[PDB]
Nucleic acid binder design. Structure first.
Ligand SMILES: [Mg+2]
Ligand SMILES: [Mg+2]
Ligand SMILES: [Zn+2]
Ligand SMILES: [Zn+2]
Ligand SMILES: [Zn+2]
Ligand SMILES: [Zn+2]
Ligand SMILES: [Zn+2]
Ligand SMILES: [Zn+2]
Lengths: 44, 137, 65, 114, 88, 351, 127, 142, 138, 100, 48, 56
RNA sequence: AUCGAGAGA
DNA sequence: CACTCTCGATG
């Protein structure tokens, strides 16, 4: 799947057997991207 | 509202009186051994992994992690990890279940290598708690 | 966080009056009481609702993520 | 977590009827009617309107527990006067007064500015 | 002149991060120089993990004085920072 | 439940306390404990014929357990035994033994004062064992010379885990002494015929507690027994092979130490016998000492099923003898109701 | 939550229907009003997201309904959120007919002043 | 209708504390036991039981409710069935069930055997005392 | 408490040297019978000898601390009736700030050393953001 | 307290107590908080990254030895002299994802 | 007596003196998990 | 549980929300307010024991 | 599960 | 000598 770096606006798509680090950055803090399947909210 | 108890206006509660965000972080890590034995993060199938959890794994991705945004509740599996110890059932389950009493939404998943080069993960789940009968003020 | 959309107690809309309140404080150089009065916040629950609010989101926006 | 749905305050449950008319065993010619999915709004009004009927000996409503949206209404009328007729007359009286109130408010609203 | 007041705050001291880390580091560094003495008499190869893992241990467990349970500092000298509220 | 047994169900009426005679100890045992190795033997997930025998109780969720089978849930615990190279002292009796040595002179094995004395006739008249022993001990420890055998009875004092003499007493010597006190003298100071004898206080061979007492997730008791067996094999090795004068004694004191601390770890002796993780180790004594102990923590009170706990609140519309129970709790907690013609319909609907 | 509290035009609400009563799946045009919200931080300064930015998507078919009330002087309405520089808010809102007894967000009225017998001539109050 | 007494009414700064019911509420009906004592585990998160402590026991004694006390201490916790030798009265019995072979090496007992119901913690205590060179001999007759 | 602090610790040696070079008789050269009214001086629990005319010494020390020449965290206790002078440079001592009251006011009486001008400078520093707490201490 | 420990006490602990028979310990050098990764690349460690990656916010000690050398890592108190955040402005703290 | 304060030593001297426990004590039937001779269990129920 | 009135048999009334609800006049023997106090509930598992509860 | 720490009545 | 939740480092 795809991930996103922490301290820069990037969009990594490196799956397994890759992980760290980032593309044109150097830091190893990677967050996972939001799901495609939309979640509803009872606006209450 | 007797004996140090209070009555709270439900209408104001609806408008957001004393509402709160509650975040919770779960932390997991892939273990390492001398003979290059390593645990892996994945979504295990019931035919290839021992023990397993009673909860479902259907919310896990290929990397054995939930995508932030997905609603989780009950004993759902948040982190999917296996540990190996031909032959059927070659893996032991080491997956992490969402808190049995708690529920909420996966707020943010963090994947990072350790100082010893160990791929470890912190999953943060968010839950909005609304003031209820029995809440301490 | 951000200015509450409606007053908890009675239900009067107050989420549209925050910027107007700030302007009434800095532009016309009014005091909080008169500013809250001109915004039609007579009941002290709404008066509180705006006066008591802390706009923390303005600090939240200081982060890049 | 254990909180009931909100619509359970006004939406009738499975099998729950609006009114449950039961014969009162205490005093003769008395009745206790269980109003479901209603509160003080209807109870106090109907009870107060039942005290206007001079052929009504007793009339009292109570909400046995604030958790559940329901109230009991006990009515005792004079002999030769069915209590259901007292409830009906009370309701119709209410409706008429509210119709007149609405009409008057409307004619009073048309004569206003700003 | 009457008895001395043993509850007098003026005759008491508060050891902060400084003195505590000082005692701990004196211990760990003496252990280190002892180990280095041993490596020296065995004959640059200095085990730095002693001070590191020592300090880390005492700061992590709250048990001041490396790994010896005979310590009376088991009352948790270092604690997890309470961050429920700013005032907290 | 469990399973049908041909044995009649009876209720415990009496509890006869006593000591474990080495004869009965080895007769009761079902497995000799020679090897100090725990389970694995040369890369093998099994059990060596030393410690943790399958005879003591299988531990791998099997269907077999020492011929009798019955899995590992039905099977209680089958004790073993280990023979010591030389006899040692039981810590909890260190005082008592030290008193018995002061009630009877050495070599021979007879009481100091008899019916010939005036005060001894009054001391032995007490029927209560504890009071009798307490009364005789005070009126017998002052005697130096002595049935004949007029040997000058030495002044015995306590030192660590051994006993001295003033005119060092070996454990074997005290065994030989208590072996010759005979029956008639036992009744005179509390002890029983076939239940508890002074010749059984000292530990010739000690029983080995089954795996259900020391489970594996290894337990501290397993490590301590491994230490005892280690000191035992060490002592035997120093005895059979080269046997120096001032070397085997240290091994004897070591075995004595480990056996003493295996039961009681909180003694006046400063060596608390730590472990590999720096832990002071959990003795059998500490397991029983409340309030977290076995008695006050698992017998006088214990966690139970069909229980609930929650934040309480007042309710003006509940009766005095009522209790508001949350729906979730009501769903959780259950009651076993037998199907009767009276309630078969209701129970059917509930199901 | 903030979106839920937003006041919408409920003039012709009596010819709209409850979703629970409507014979459709989930919601439709006869029972609900769908309105979108697409906001994105453009300027270097803070980009405010108001209730005016809500855009009706469903078919109102004549009924005066769904339109978010703007009593604001500048014509903005309720301040829903604030975006930075690269922050984005993309969402869809389904508004349904409701009772304030179910949730206070469906409250058409604010405070109702109520007073009888100003001189306490009835003595309903012991001062 | 008006209220007779007038009410002290006004703004006051209140705070919400960390203790909320849904984080406290706990109920267990037959759950996971421990391994050593075979008693209900400790903790709400581990679906554990609640300690029927000494003082609660004292209360039930004061009430006179004996059967309830026994039920709390057996069926609702660790109820275990053990075999006792008719001679020495220890848990030396090797009960080969399904063959009815109740052996006992040491006294040669096969026909004079007994069966009792005690807590598993009691069995543990007795075993530990036996491992401490003490014989808690259990006789079933006066 | 909000303003309480802890002594970090400092070198007592220069204070010792100062004392000896300001009329403190060495303890090894002390004869009690020929000087009974001699105030004995202590430093960190150590008796470094006695000192006649202790008032001048105390005013000098206090002036040095208030100037900054002696570290402000160093405590100086003058016990008159007990005729002792205890100086502590010990670390871990919990202290707190206090307004200094002096009677050097000619056209007045005993007043606070700090004046409204100082406060004006402080609030000037507050509004601008050069006159801080350290300047109050110095 | 911590600043007192670093700027003075440490040197006293190393110099005034240790000498072997020879190797005499000289000055002590305390770096800025850094991490030696498994990658091998040693780099600057900021507090947020330390808390996120379960690392230890510590600096290295280097002593001059006679007849230089790393002797271990000292945990650094935040907002201390050797801490990056002490010299940091508000905007810096915001960029460093540290709350001002 | 072992269910209070001095626990283990009481059992020690009990085993050393070979004491007989009547098991008609409350805590003793509490340990044995049997219906103690308490109130409800202060008698027997038979059939006639 | 200081005295016998700390453990008393109550009649169950299943109610919504997540709190053990009790009558005010039962506060005194339990010694309990409602400022965060928690209570325990034990369910009998046979007829004779629930008889013990209901009758004693 | 074994030891310390915070806190709830 | 006098019931809970919890956290967090340890074998
Ligand atoms: Mg109270
Ligand atoms: Mg309370
Ligand atoms: Zn990057
Ligand atoms: Zn208001
Ligand atoms: Zn078996
Ligand atoms: Zn003799
Ligand atoms: Zn529809
Ligand atoms: Zn037998």
């Amino acid at each position: 799947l795809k991930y996103i770096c922490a301290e820069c606006s990037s969009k990594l798509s490196l799956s397994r057997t890759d992980a760290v680090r980032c593309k044109d950055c150097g830091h190893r803090i990677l967050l996972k991207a939001r799901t495609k399947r939309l979640v509803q909210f009872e606006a209450r | 509202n007797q004996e140090d108890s209070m009555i709270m206006n439900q209408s104001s509660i609806d408008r957001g009186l004393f509402r709160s965000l509650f975040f919770r972080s779960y932390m997991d890590q892939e273990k390492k051994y001398g003979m290059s034995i390593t645990e892996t993060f994945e979504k295990p199938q019931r035919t290839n992994t021992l023990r397993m959890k009673h909860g479902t794994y259907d919310k896990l991705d290929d990397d054995g992690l939930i995508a932030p945004g997905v609603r989780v509740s009950g004993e759902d599996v948040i982190i999917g990890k296996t540990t190996p110890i031909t032959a059927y059932h070659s893996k032991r389950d080491a997956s992490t279940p969402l808190r049995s009493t708690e529920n909420g939404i996966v707020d943010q998943v963090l994947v990072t290598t350790n100082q010893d080069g160990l791929k470890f993960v912190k999953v943060r789940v968010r839950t909005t708690k609304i003031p209820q009968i029995g809440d301490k003020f | 966080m951000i200015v509450p959309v409606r007053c908890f107690s009675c239900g009067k809309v107050v989420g549209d009056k925050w910027e107007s309140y700030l302007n009434l404080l800095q532009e016309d150089e009014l005091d909080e009481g008169t500013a809250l009065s001109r915004l039609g916040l007579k009941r002290y629950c709404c008066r509180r609702m705006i006066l008591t609010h802390v706009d923390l989101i303005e600090k939240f926006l200081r982060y890049n993520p | 977590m254990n909180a009931p749905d909100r619509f359970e305050l006004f939406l009738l449950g499975e099998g729950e009827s609006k009114l449950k008319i039961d014969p009162d065993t205490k005093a003769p010619n008395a009745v206790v009617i269980t109003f479901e999915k209603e509160d003080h709004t209807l109870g106090n009004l109907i009870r107060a309107e039942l005290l206007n009927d001079r052929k009504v000996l007793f009339a009292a409503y109570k909400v046995e527990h604030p958790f559940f949206a329901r109230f009991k209404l006990r009515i005792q009328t004079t002999e030769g006067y069915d209590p259901k007729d007292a409830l009906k007359n009370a309701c119709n009286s209410i409706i008429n007064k509210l119709g007149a109130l609405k009409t008057n408010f409307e004619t009073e609203w048309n004569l206003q500015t700003l | 002149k009457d008895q001395d007041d043993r509850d007098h705050f003026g005759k008491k001291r508060l050891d902060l991060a400084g003195p505590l880390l000082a005692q701990l580091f004196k211990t760990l560094f003496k252990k280190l120089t002892k180990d280095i003495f041993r490596y020296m008499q065995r004959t640059l190869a200095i085990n730095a993990k002693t001070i590191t893992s020592g300090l880390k241990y005492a700061l992590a467990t709250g048990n001041w004085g490396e790994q010896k349970k005979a310590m009376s500092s088991r009352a948790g000298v270092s604690q997890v920072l309470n961050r429920y509220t700013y005032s907290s | 439940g469990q399973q049908y047994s041909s044995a009649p169900l009876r209720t415990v009426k009496e509890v006869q306390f006593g000591l474990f005679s080495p004869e009965e100890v080895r007769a009761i045992s079902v497995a000799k404990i020679r090897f100090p190795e725990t389970m694995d033997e040369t890369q093998t997930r099994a059990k060596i014929g030393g410690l943790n025998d399958p005879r003591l109780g299988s531990i791998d969720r099997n269907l077999k357990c020492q011929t009798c089978q019955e899995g590992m849930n039905e099977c209680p615990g089958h004790f073993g035994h280990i023979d010591l190279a030389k006899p040692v002292f039981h810590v909890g009796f260190i005082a008592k033994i030290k008193k018995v040595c002061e009630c009877v002179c050495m070599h021979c094995g007879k009481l100091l004062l008899d019916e010939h004395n005036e005060l001894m006739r009054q001391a032995l008249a007490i029927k209560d064992s504890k009071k009798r022993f307490a009364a005789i001990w005070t009126l017998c420890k002052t005697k130096m010379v002595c049935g004949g055998c007029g040997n000058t009875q030495p002044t015995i004092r306590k030192d660590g885990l051994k006993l001295v003499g003033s005119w060092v007493l070996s454990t074997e010597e005290i065994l030989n002494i208590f072996k010759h006190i005979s029956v008639k003298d036992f009744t005179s100071l509390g002890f029983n015929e076939v239940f508890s004898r002074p010749e059984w206080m000292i530990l010739t061979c000690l029983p080995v507690p089954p795996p259900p007492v020391r489970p594996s997730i290894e337990d501290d008791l397993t490590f301590k027994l491994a230490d005892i067996l280690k000191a035992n094999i060490s002592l035997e090795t120093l005895e059979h092979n080269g046997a120096p004068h001032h070397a085997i004694e240290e091994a004897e004191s070591l075995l004595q130490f480990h056996v003493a601390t295996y039961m009681d770890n909180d003694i006046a002796g400063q060596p608390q016998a730590l472990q590999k993780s720096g832990r002071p180790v959990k003795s059998i004594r500490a397991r029983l000492k409340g309030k977290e102990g076995r008695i006050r923590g698992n017998l006088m009170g214990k966690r139970v099923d069909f229980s609930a706990r929650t934040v309480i609140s007042g309710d003006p519309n509940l009766e005095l003898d009522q209790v508001g129970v949350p729906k979730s709790i009501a769903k959780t907690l259950t009651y076993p109701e037998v199907v009767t013609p009276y309630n078969i319909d209701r129970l059917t609907q509930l199901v | 939550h903030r979106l839920g509290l937003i006041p919408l035009q409920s003039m012709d609400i009596e010819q709209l229907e409850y979703s629970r009563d409507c014979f459709c799946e989930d919601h439709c045009d006869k029972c609900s009003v769908v309105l979108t919200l697409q906001a994105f931080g453009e300027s270097e300064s803070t980009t405010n997201v108001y209730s005016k930015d809500l855009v009706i998507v469903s078919n109102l078919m004549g009924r005066n309904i769904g339109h978010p009330i703007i009593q604001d002087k500048e014509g903005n309405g309720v301040l829903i959120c604030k975006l930075r520089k690269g922050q984005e808010l993309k969402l869809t809102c389904v508004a349904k007919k409701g009772i304030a007894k179910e949730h206070a967000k469906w409250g058409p009225a604010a405070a109702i002043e109520f007073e009888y017998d100003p001189w306490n001539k009835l003595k309903h109050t012991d001062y | 209708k008006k209220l007779m007494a007038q009410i002290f009414f006004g703004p006051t700064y209140y705070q919400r504390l960390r203790h909320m019911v849904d984080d406290k509420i706990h109920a267990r009906a037959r759950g996971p036991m421990q391994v050593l004592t075979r008693q209900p585990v400790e903790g709400r998160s581990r679906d554990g039981g609640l300690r029927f402590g000494e003082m609660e026991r004292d209360c039930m004694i004061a009430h006179g409710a004996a059967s309830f006390l026994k039920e709390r201490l057996m069926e609702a916790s660790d109820a275990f069935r053990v075999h006792i030798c008719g001679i020495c009265g220890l848990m030396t019995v090797i009960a080969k069930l399904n063959h009815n072979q109740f052996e006992c090496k040491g006294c040669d007992n096969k026909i004079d055997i007994y069966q009792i119901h005690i807590p598993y913690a009691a069995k543990l205590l007795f075993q530990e005392l036996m491992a401490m060179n003490i014989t808690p001999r259990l006789y079933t007759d006066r | 408490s909000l303003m309480s602090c802890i002594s970090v610790g400092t070198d007592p040696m220069p204070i010792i040297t100062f004392l000896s070079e300001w009329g403190m008789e060495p303890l090894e050269d002390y004869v009690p019978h020929q000087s009974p009214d001699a105030t004995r001086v202590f430093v960190n629990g150590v008796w470094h000898g006695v000192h006649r005319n202790p008032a001048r010494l105390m005013e000098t020390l206090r002036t040095l601390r208030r100037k900054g020449d002696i570290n402000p965290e160093v405590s100086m206790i003058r016990d008159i009736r007990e005729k002792e002078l205890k100086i502590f440079t010990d670390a871990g001592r919990v202290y707190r700030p206090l307004f200094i009251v002096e009677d050097d006011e000619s056209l007045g009486h005993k007043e606070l050393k700090v004046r409204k001008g100082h406060i004006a400078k402080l609030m000037a520093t507050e509004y601008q953001d050069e006159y801080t707490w350290s300047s109050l201490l110095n | 307290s911590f600043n007192q420990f670093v700027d003075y006490t440490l040197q006293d602990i190393i110099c005034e107590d240790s000498t072997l028979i020879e190797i005499s310990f000289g000055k002590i050098y305390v770096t800025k908080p850094m991490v030696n990764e498994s990658d091998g690349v040693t780099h600057a460690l900021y507090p947020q990254e330390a808390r996120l990656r379960n690392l230890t916010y510590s600096s290295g000690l280097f002593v001059d030895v006679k007849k230089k050398v790393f002797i271990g890592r000292l945990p650094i108190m935040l907002r201390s002299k050797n801490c990056y955040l002490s010299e940091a402005t508000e905007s810096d703290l915001y960029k460093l994802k540290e709350c001002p | 007596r072992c269910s209070f304060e001095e626990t283990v030593e009481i059992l020690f001297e009990a085993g050393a003196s070979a004491e007989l426990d009547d098991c008609r004590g409350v805590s003793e039937n509490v340990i044995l998990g049997q219906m103690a001779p308490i109130g409800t269990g202060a008698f027997d129920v038979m059939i006639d | 549980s200081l005295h016998k009135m700390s453990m008393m048999a109550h009649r169950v009334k299943v109610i919504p929300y997540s709190t053990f609800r009790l009558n005010l006049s039962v506060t005194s023997p339990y010694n309990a307010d409602f400022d965060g106090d928690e209570m325990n509930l034990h369910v009998p598992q046979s007829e004779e024991t629930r008889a013990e509860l209901s009758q004693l």
